[PDB]
Design a protein around this ligand. Structure first.
Ligand SMILES: Nc1nc2c(ncn2[C@@H]2O[C@@H]3COP(=O)(O)O[C@H]4[C@@H](O)[C@H](n5cnc6c(N)ncnc65)O[C@@H]4COP(=O)(O)O[C@H]3[C@H]2O)c(=O)[nH]1
Lengths: 175, 175
């Protein structure tokens, strides 16, 4: 399944690079080192494959707050390729605010684009199926990785949970 | 074929973002705005799927010279994700000196790591087959894209051609 390649590539090409470094990148963040309590990356996976470039456009309670210190890695001929995470602020009631290291699995944007291309390499139904398999395979990879296990949460978001991202994140935080 | 996903993803997730911006990013570069004469990106594809992080380790004539002006693009929740190309100096026996925007198709590193993993979802022999299909599919995709067609070159490199990277680049430049 094409989902298998996307899951393995998100692991080897991103999570395996950034997750073993995650606590150190947080410790270097003067703004966020003490505002992020659980040192974990939250990865949104939309079942619809609808990735939002600004997560506040999906749920306005989830607003971009800042960058973590970027990783700089020599990779594929690029000296000091920049790997950058985002911190989002979540406020559900007026009583508590939360700061999450948060992003979409952005390679899924290519699955969306594939299903729209003129030659139709992927139907919309096939795309939905592959997102399900992507979640399953990525979780299986992470569960077997000693360097990455426990440092990230895969968060599937259904189409009718678009405006509920804040609720889901705060619930998981309070597990 | 898993190679189809890698080809579509390298196109939609990278080339379609950076190639329309490449001319402006070359023009903004203080070091290379005049040294890069043809405004295009050369993509190395190793048939072995073995990517060198320093291309000079394969062909000593091809040395890292600097960064191009990086693109900043909001992407999947990341504000101003950084997309950076690399410029390589190529020095031949004629004493002629060239500067190329050059990189590996870096998602192929994941395909290599897949073939080596304890739970390898593909064999080393299937990896070879998949790199061939990646080249073919990426060519077909780029074939049909007006904004990207003239702005990049796919450069397959076999194991016994590692030390001939400079020859191929300079030959294509003089096509
Ligand atoms: N939040 C975040 N995610 C990243 C970053 N870099 C990669 N990722 C994610 O891992 C996927 C695979 O990365 P790859 O490096 O192994 O292949 C990359 C790589 O081959 C190329 N590419 C993307 N950004 C690049 C860049 N800045 N430089 C060189 N190549 C780049 O496009 C491919 C797919 O990009 P993508 O955004 O769709 O998917 C990424 C992306 O979801 C990053 O810096 N920040």
């Amino acid at each position: 399944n094409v989902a298998d390649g996307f899951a393995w590539n998100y692991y080897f090409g991103y999570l395996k690079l950034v997750l073993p470094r995650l606590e150190a990148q947080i410790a270097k963040s003067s703004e966020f080192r003490y505002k992020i309590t659980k040192k974990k990356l939250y990865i949104l996976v939309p079942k619809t494959c609808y990735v939002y470039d600004n997560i506040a456009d999906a749920d306005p309670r989830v607003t971009w707050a800042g960058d973590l210190t970027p990783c700089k890695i020599n990779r594929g001929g690029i000296k000091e390729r920049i790997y950058k995470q985002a911190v989002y602020r979540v406020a559900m009631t007026d009583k508590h605010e939360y700061f999450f290291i948060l992003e979409y699995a952005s390679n899924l944007m290519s699955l969306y684009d594939m299903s729209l291309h003129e030659d139709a390499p992927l139907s919309r139904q096939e795309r939905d199926d592959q997102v399900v398999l992507f979640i399953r395979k990525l979780r299986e990879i992470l569960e077997g990785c000693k360097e990455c296990r426990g440092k990230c949460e895969i968060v599937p978001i259904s189409g009718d949970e678009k405006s509920k991202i804040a609720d889901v994140l705060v619930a998981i935080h309070n597990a």
